[PDB]
Amino acid sequence: GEFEKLEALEQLQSHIEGWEGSNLTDICTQLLLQGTLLKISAGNIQERAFFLFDNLLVYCKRKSKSINGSLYIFRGRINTEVMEVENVEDGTADYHSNGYTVTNGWKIHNTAKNKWFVCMAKTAEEKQKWLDAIIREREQRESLKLGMERDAYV
Ligand code: NI
């Protein structure tokens, strides 16, 4: 049942061409949420596939069963320990959003690479889904770590 999840992670990763860094089965145990979001960079709002696992966020370009087997092209990853997430209020337009107007969005800084971007969901409910999952992943990760220091004598 634990191993079955690892096998699913391995399957997913095999559909992502251009994978960089450690394997999903080395650092993750499950996929918590996946979905399409708009990612903002200079002169680009681009649709990207986002995947939140325990310990890792990954974003990819979606390829339109594929002919060659791969369904996504790797774009980036963030260890959730170095991922700083902040809310963006609707209507905000500033240098963090590359001059674009944000609705149903949020900002992510990756402090391992000193890179940032803004994400937008299509609806408020979808933003709340993403934020809730981001909070749950952090809470669980902090709950594990601490639990394992509080379980020092057991
Ligand atoms: Ni900043």
Curated annotation (Swiss-Prot):
Location of Phosphoserine modifications: S66
Tissue specificity of this protein: Mainly expressed in peripheral blood leukocytes and brain. Expressed at intermediate level in spleen and lymph nodes, and weakly expressed in other tissues.
Residues of the signal peptide: none
Organism placement in taxonomy: Eukaryota, Metazoa, Chordata, Craniata, Vertebrata
Function of the protein: Functions as a RAC guanine nucleotide exchange factor (GEF), which activates the Rac proteins by exchanging bound GDP for free GTP. Its activity is synergistically activated by phosphatidylinositol 3,4,5-trisphosphate and the beta gamma subunits of heterotrimeric G protein. May function downstream of heterotrimeric G proteins in neutrophils.
Domain PH, residue spans: 30-139
Subunit details: Interacts preferentially with RAC2. Interacts with RAC1. Interacts with AUTS2.
Domain of life from the UniProt record: Eukaryota
Intracellular or extracellular location(s): Cytoplasm, Cytosol; Cell membrane
UniProt-recorded name of the protein: Phosphatidylinositol 3,4,5-trisphosphate-dependent Rac exchanger 1 protein
The species this protein was found in: Homo sapiens (Human)
